[PDB]
Design a protein around this ligand. Structure first.
Ligand SMILES: *N1CCC[C@@H]1[C@H](c1ccccc1)c1ccccc1OCCOC
Ligand SMILES: *N1CCC[C@@H]1[C@H](c1ccccc1)c1ccccc1OCCOC
Ligand SMILES: [Cl-]
Ligand SMILES: [Cl-]
Ligand SMILES: [Mg+2]
Ligand code: NA
Ligand code: NA
Lengths: 228, 7, 6, 228
């Protein structure tokens, strides 16, 4: 790609500069270039990739929601511009999903990174699902569920129930069930089981881990309260 | 820098 | 409903 | 161009939608397309054009300042990335200056539009001056000065001393003197006489005009009190 001629280490350095400058499209492009070098990502690098694209897609999602709200209240212009933003958002999600399928997931060297990437695959199919319609939406929903479920299977075998990545996966998968798949009972069951299984082990954690885990447990609780 | 017109 | 904020 | 097949009114409508969605690059592109239809801009449309490009270049300027500070404190990567942002900033300023020279600045026209656009030309040369060095900087500085001076001459002949466009021009020209042209004495004098001459004429204004004028007068005073 456009970053093919730049050293991997230079791309990582420039991603960090872009973050300091709040230039998230640049940050994402640098991180894409780094992924495309074909080497695994460290934990810090995975987080850089996720932060960069979350900022990009997050801005597009917020704009799409503004435009969709105007459209629903309402010539063809609002629809056309909503569709333009929608196509750009779909492009970014397709880019992220392409990095995960080629080849971050299959090259992930440990269970934690594999769960991180399968969760991310679920998340980006979920973002697609928010704007999809008809048969395409149904396929996207099934793809999201399959990625999340694979991540769940690995995290139950390989990670303790208080592990923050495992907890965040369960949080986002339960949001998927509720907001996307019209499965509130699955959402509640998953959040509840995850909350209880983590609570059982909170006393074994250090001060920092306790804070990390109860932070995400509190995010599960907020959703349960909204849902229950 | 000194601020310019914010619009 | 909010997802993980990072 | 990508906007050539779109109706003028649709471009203006989409610029307004882009503003609501805080999509300023899109907003600027729509307004550029509208300018290219070859009709004069109304007051509201001039303000849309200005807000759009202000936000685009404002983000670039802020990023450039972050990167330049990192560079001054400090491989080639910081310089390379600062140069990349700088080139994109210069490209936007060149786009704006091109629109002004090719479409918008005319010998004809009401005082309100002629001053507005000449001020804008001064502003975008000033933004180029912020990143320029050496003799190139000298020429750019003189281009900004010449545009501001022509706008000043028109504003003093054709507008009352409380006119908000005249006041904002004096504000920015005084910032030019202080920050770019190494003339703080001139900056201070211009801000003070502008403020004082507006103060003396406030009694002629309605409640609404009074708020419009006094808001810009307050900005002049803020700079005066900062500088003295
Ligand atoms: N700045 C220059 C022209 C656009 C913007 C205007 C502005 C906003 C806030 C403070 C000062 C100027 C502006 C934007 C949208 C609507 C009206 C506006 O101002 C008209 C008066 O300009 C001096
Ligand atoms: N969200 C997922 C990966 C990036 C972001 C992380 C996060 C931030 C705040 C709350 C929850 C997750 C994140 C970003 C930067 C540094 C570290 C991060 O978390 C890493 C492990 O915690 C889940
Ligand atoms: Cl459009
Ligand atoms: Cl670069
Ligand atoms: Mg045409
Ligand atoms: Na037409
Ligand atoms: Na003072």
């Amino acid at each position: 790609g456009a970053m093919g001629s730049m050293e991997r280490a230079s791309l990582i350095q420039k991603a960090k500069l872009a973050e300091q400058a709040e230039r998230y499209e640049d940050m994402a492009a640098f991180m894409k270039g780094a992924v495309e070098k074909g080497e695994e990502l460290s934990c810090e690098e995975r987080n850089l990739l996720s932060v960069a694209y979350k900022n990009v897609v997050g801005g597009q999602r917020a704009a799409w929601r503004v435009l969709s709200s105007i459209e629903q209240k309402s010539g063809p212009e609002v629809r056309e511009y909503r569709e333009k933003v929608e196509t750009e958002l779909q492009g970014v999600c397709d880019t992220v999903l392409g990095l995960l399928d080629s080849h971050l997931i299959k090259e992930a060297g440990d269970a934690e990174s594999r769960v991180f990437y399968l969760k991310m695959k679920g998340d980006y199919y979920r973002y697609l699902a928010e704007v999809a319609t008809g048969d395409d939406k149904k396929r996207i929903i099934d793809s999201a569920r399959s990625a999340y479920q694979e991540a769940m299977d690995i995290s139950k075998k390989e990670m303790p129930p208080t592990n923050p990545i495992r907890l965040g996966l369960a949080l986002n998968f339960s949001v998927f069930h509720y907001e996307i798949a019209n499965s509130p009972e699955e959402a509640i069951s998953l959040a509840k089981t995850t909350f209880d299984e983590a609570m059982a082990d909170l006393h074994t954690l250090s001060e920092d881990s306790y804070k990390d885990s109860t932070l995400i447990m509190q995010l599960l609780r907020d959703n349960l309260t909204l849902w229950t | 820098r000194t601020p310019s017109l914010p619009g | 409903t909010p997802s993980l904020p990072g």
